[PDB]
Amino acid sequence: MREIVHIQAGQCGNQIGAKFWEVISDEHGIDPTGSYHGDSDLQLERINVYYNEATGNKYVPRAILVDLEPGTMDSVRSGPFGQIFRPDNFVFGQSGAGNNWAKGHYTEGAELVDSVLDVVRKESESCDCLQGFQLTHSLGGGTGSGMGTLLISKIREEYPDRIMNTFSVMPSPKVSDTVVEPYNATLSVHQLVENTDETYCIDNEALYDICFRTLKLTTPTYGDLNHLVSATMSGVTTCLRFPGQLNADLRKLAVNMVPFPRLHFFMPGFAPLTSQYRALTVPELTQQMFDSKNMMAACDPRHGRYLTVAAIFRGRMSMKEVDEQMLNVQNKNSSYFVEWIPNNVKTAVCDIPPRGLKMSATFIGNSTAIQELFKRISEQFTAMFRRKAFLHWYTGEGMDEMEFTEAESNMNDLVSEYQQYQDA
Amino acid sequence: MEVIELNKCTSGQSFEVILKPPDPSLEEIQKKLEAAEERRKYQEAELLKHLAE
Amino acid sequence: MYTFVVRDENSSVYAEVSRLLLATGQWKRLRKDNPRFNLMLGERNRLPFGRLGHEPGLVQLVNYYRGADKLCRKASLVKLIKTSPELSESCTWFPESYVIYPGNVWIAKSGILISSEAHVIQKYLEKPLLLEPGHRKFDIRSWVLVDHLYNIYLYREGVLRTSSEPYNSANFQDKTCHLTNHCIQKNYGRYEEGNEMFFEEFNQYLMDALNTTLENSILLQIKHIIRSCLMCIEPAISTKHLHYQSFQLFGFDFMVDEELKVWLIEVNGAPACAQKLYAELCQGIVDVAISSVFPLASIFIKLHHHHHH
Amino acid sequence: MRECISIHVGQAGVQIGNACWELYCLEHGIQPDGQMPSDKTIGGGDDSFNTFFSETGAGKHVPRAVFVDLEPTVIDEVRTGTYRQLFHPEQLITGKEDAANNYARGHYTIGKEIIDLVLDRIRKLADQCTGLQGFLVFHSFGGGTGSGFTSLLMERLSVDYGKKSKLEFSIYPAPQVSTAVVEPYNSILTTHTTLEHSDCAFMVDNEAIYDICRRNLDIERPTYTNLNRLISQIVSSITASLRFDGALNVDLTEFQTNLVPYPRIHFPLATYAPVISAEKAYHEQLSVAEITNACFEPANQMVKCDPRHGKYMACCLLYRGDVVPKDVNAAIATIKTKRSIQFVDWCPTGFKVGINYQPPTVVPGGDLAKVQRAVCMLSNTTAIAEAWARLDHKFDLMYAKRAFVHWYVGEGMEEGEFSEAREDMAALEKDYEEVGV
């Protein structure tokens, strides 16, 4: 289990998806044309996880770029690291999805899905040992949301034993393209509850607040939001992209993070938040990454309880000081960590730091407080759905109101399920 | 405290000192490995049946 | 900010320690089954000592010494005394006792039988010291705190748990004059409040009536018995070098005879304090047992003697 | 003599195997290539070291070892490391995809597709044996492979080799060096299914080895390399009687006779002294009295627990270095009067002593200093049940909520196997209480 297959779907999916390949390609010493120009052998030791090797010793990302319109995929190819991607893996329709889940899942995206799967099969075939699939998308638009979850369902049919993880960007009125986002998100959440092993709930509400309140950016662009997302995507892939004596694949990590199958929606975090000169001390990284203000999902962890935590520290620091600080927050805030999963906070350290920071920490929290995210989207949904508002866009593509009622019910069940373990 | 059964040799010695006196078959294993594979294959069938709907 | 748990709800002593800890701002209480504690105020029966000292980055302390039941049950106390050479069968301060499983007066106990006909059968003290005016029996209770370093701290305040009924040699069935317990009395409180004579008054009586002191006539023998008992078991229970640490409060029960000789009756592992003395003792348990191990931002007398021979 | 096959299962098993075989080579003067100059019978023999090594016509000394892991990366390091020539490729067996810390995946799913191959590679070693004693099995309680596959192997080895003895070297899980959260499940599952198939098992709590490395070696944050080199000293101590001339613990059957009167209660406590830092400039060498006395300090035990509150069924002192019987008897005499050593009524209160005059060998550039004399005490005490109580408590907490259970069921396992396995353990804890109170 070494090779991961990456799929990025829709505008958001391809935007954060591009930023991922930019950040890690720098970290592995790969230039915009795919040639290695590093120095440490640690940069090439597990390069096979995300890159295929080509003739002339070129490295090509194991990446598939999906969209229902060309606009954003033309922008990726023009962008800084656009040339590195395999041309055959650019799979795109023409008519778009108009921020419509139904178009993505049932009509327009149905027409394009099989050709995306042929490319997935092409990449999966020449994989010594495929550990799983990772996906980037938003849940609020049409393509990444509707088509991305259709793909996820298809991938599970053909590869039912492989791990499926997502970075799923959640919609928010604060950073909002259209009024129908809650509809699209609710339909998508139900897909993710059934068909993924881990979903990193990137909340645009939270990313905006971090940019506004804690970074002093008055008018945050999607670039400012995506900078925070890319640091976290780098963070959660560190322990697969490098050593250091940790012998874990996606399944092993999944086994240790997911105590119940439907409850696999994580609350990511990062320290320090940037947009520096003084490196942070280990106590600062620890207190910052556990702070609500640094959470990428707009939930208050004091309103729930942690099922599991993972934390991956980067940089040259004392592993003794890390153990001590991690034990310090647990033993001084032990009410918020469930007592019925002993030793639920686990930690790793990686010597290679990311570009620009002398030391950092990525936080992966499986907390029952994530119900607040789902409650918020459920309230936005019902506000419209009780008057059947904007439904004609969906019934026009063949959907019944029944399917909305079902999805509403599935998400309120998820919320109830989280509430169960918060009181246990 | 009696020092009994002293045995010596060129690489060492040993003694005792007393301070005071007073499985299933190859059928059943291959059977229940395969019964777990039935449940594994029935669960995968239930999934591919669900995804077919 | 240190953490503790409370697994004995009955304990009147550690209720007050629970309260005194909380009202500093530096001790947070946790749920009964939370494993991430600094301090365990534990149950009486089946305290899980095997689970202590295995939580990384937490110095763990418990308020019971494992193995200390061998001093506190009557059956095992008698067997400890007859088997340890440091105490021996020729022990001058323990009544002659025998074990049989379920002046020639005896007492049976573990429902109490005082007779010559007929658990442990113990020699009955036929001629005890009798306080006047009253002509009445008593027993002395001393509280002893053994900390994590095995310092043996005797609390300066003890108490005489008095009988109110005149002592009778012929009449054994009437329990109120022979058995001197607090529950059995409740003439309940004729001579002193709740049948409790404290050390200031009892010293004064010995001075006035017998021309001697509590310190000389009695307390020297109490200090000898406490120290001899606990140093005997030190190897079996000491938590020095151990992955968790223990302290414990003991209640030693004594009888002083007519010739001013002190006798050990029972040692108590989960003792209750007298009403007046809770505030001072329970503060003393915090300073010496708990705060020594977990420092924040003398009422005891230390029992040590190194005679050379 | 009679041959012994070592089996190393999972990461923990393999990396501890490496350490032990590295050590065994230094002890017998065998070199990385496999040549042993001091051996004069070329191409064969029935010396004591031949119980652990076979010979070839070219003069190579080859471990009676099989390394098994469900993924290649750890055993790959044995194929490319300092002792690569030592092992025949057929001894090093690897799958592609690991057990993901899932007992059920190691036992049922991935176990099934590799069990017959491994037994075949074991049979290739058993056929080079004129009189096989049995097996030394090295693994973790916490890993999916270490727990799951080991228990399947141990079931089959009883069928294929019913006459032979099976010893375990078992790494008991410690949160301070484990990233697995489900180890309590894996440990109980594999203990339950392995119990009737194991004659004697030596548990090593990673917590204890870790603190011995901190306290006595001055290592700030101990690695697996630190822990393993120390573990292999203990293992060597235990196996030395099988590899050297002597009269105590000469075969695998004698470990069961000397240490295990009550078959289910086959978990002897190992205590080891002295552990001394090579970086320590001035070290005053410790005597027979001081190191024998150190065998009754909890801080030197392989599992932290309190022998004082418990009872002994058997005790064995294995000394290495400058030791003579009368110094041992004098040390035991002092210690009986100071410490609380209570035996069960039906067993004789006494010690079987084994001395080998060769002082412990230390790995060059290692953490351990050379010492004039060392000891490993092997005592079967009911106090070790403390480790079962801790493990069972953790199990109960998680299992009450069915936390993580779906991962096990998804690999074909039935929920009932959890409570069934837990009940065996409940009985085991009860068996220890009857004997010891």
Ligand SMILES: CC(C)(C)c1nc[nH]c1/C=c1\[nH]c(=O)/c(=C/c2cccc(C(=O)c3ccccc3)c2)[nH]c1=O
């Ligand atoms: C701290 C440590 C190692 C002891 C530990 N202890 C428990 N857990 C851990 C750590 C992790 N556990 C995971 O399960 C994990 C999953 C993972 C890995 C890579 C990628 C993606 C992913 O969804 C994605 C999808 C699209 C684009 C980018 C990323 C998820 N990453 C971790 O860092």
Ligand SMILES: Nc1nc2c(ncn2[C@@H]2O[C@H](COP(=O)(O)OP(=O)(O)OP(=O)(O)O)[C@@H](O)[C@H]2O)c(=O)[nH]1
């Ligand atoms: N002492 C010691 N313990 C180890 C070593 N490697 C892993 N462990 C411990 O073993 C447990 C994890 O099991 P592993 O042996 O890594 O797992 P595995 O048997 O390889 O099986 P899977 O990885 O689940 O397929 C944890 O408690 C680790 O602390 C080692 O080299 N030495």
Ligand SMILES: Nc1ncnc2c1ncn2[C@@H]1O[C@H](COP(=O)(O)OP(=O)(O)CP(=O)(O)O)[C@@H](O)[C@H]1O
């Ligand atoms: N050998 C003896 N001689 C004289 N009186 C005795 C005696 N043994 C017991 N007693 C009396 O009986 C009373 C109660 O008995 P004992 O002290 O053995 O049990 P107990 O449990 O009631 C004390 P506690 O509950 O305070 O620990 C004592 O207060 C004492 O006065």
Ligand SMILES: Nc1nc2c(ncn2[C@@H]2O[C@H](COP(=O)(O)OP(=O)(O)O)[C@@H](O)[C@H]2O)c(=O)[nH]1
């Ligand atoms: N964080 C982030 N969110 C985005 C980005 N682009 C779009 N979104 C969000 O995604 C949703 C719109 O989906 P989009 O990906 O544009 O639609 P699609 O192309 O049809 O899949 C809205 O909720 C937007 O707030 C981006 O680059 N970054």
Ligand SMILES: [Ca+2]
């Ligand atoms: Ca069309």
Ligand SMILES: [Ca+2]
């Ligand atoms: Ca030979």
Ligand SMILES: [Mg+2]
């Ligand atoms: Mg858009």
Ligand SMILES: [Mg+2]
């Ligand atoms: Mg492994």
